[PDB]
Amino acid sequence: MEKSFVITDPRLPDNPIIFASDGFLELTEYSREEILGRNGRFLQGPETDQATVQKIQDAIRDQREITVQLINYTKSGKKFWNLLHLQPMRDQKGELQYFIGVQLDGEFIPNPLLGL
Ligand SMILES: Cc1cc2nc3c(=O)[nH]c(=O)nc-3n(C[C@H](O)[C@H](O)[C@H](O)COP(=O)(O)O)c2cc1C
Ligand SMILES: [Cl-]
Ligand SMILES: [Co+2]
Ligand SMILES: [Mg+2]
Numbered sequence: 001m002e003k004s005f006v007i008t009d010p011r012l013p014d015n016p017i018i019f020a021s022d023g024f025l026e027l028t029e030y031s032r033e034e035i036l037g038r039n040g041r042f043l044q045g046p047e048t049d050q051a052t053v054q055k056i057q058d059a060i061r062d063q064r065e066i067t068v069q070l071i072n073y074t075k076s077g078k079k080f081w082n083l084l085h086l087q088p089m090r091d092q093k094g095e096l097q098y099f100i101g102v103q104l105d106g107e108f109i110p111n112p113l114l115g116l
């Protein structure tokens with residue numbers, strides 16, 4: 001598929017998605033009109049490890065890059081493992097301007113090892 005990614009605007013409330021790539025539409029099954037303006041957490045669901053979600057929340061707070069592997073769900077409810085790479089984007093003034101999150105679909109690290 002084409003690269004899956006979204007770009008959020010942390011200068012707006014709760015880091016809304018302001019751009020979603022064609023690859024993200026394909027991976028997630030959502031239309032661009034269903035995605036724009038919401039927070040990336042909408043892909044989570046019952047099996048998502050809340051401890052991983054907290055690591056993401058702390059990375060966003062600290063404006064630090066992180067990679068995690070977590071369960072996400074397509075529009076039709078299909079589970080997928082998401083190796084999610086989040087990167088803060090700063091402008092030439094040193095100010096946070098975006099986050100970008102790149103999704104790679106696959107159980108890259110086996111779940112028995114992820115669990116620790
Ligand atoms: C650019 C960007 C992309 C994100 N993409 C995803 C994603 O693909 N899947 C997901 O589960 N969370 C994704 N998130 C994480 C959530 O948006 C959120 O930061 C996380 O769930 C932690 O915050 P919370 O505890 O308030 O939900 C993304 C966040 C950012 C900033
Ligand atoms: Cl966020
Ligand atoms: Co591809
Ligand atoms: Mg939550």
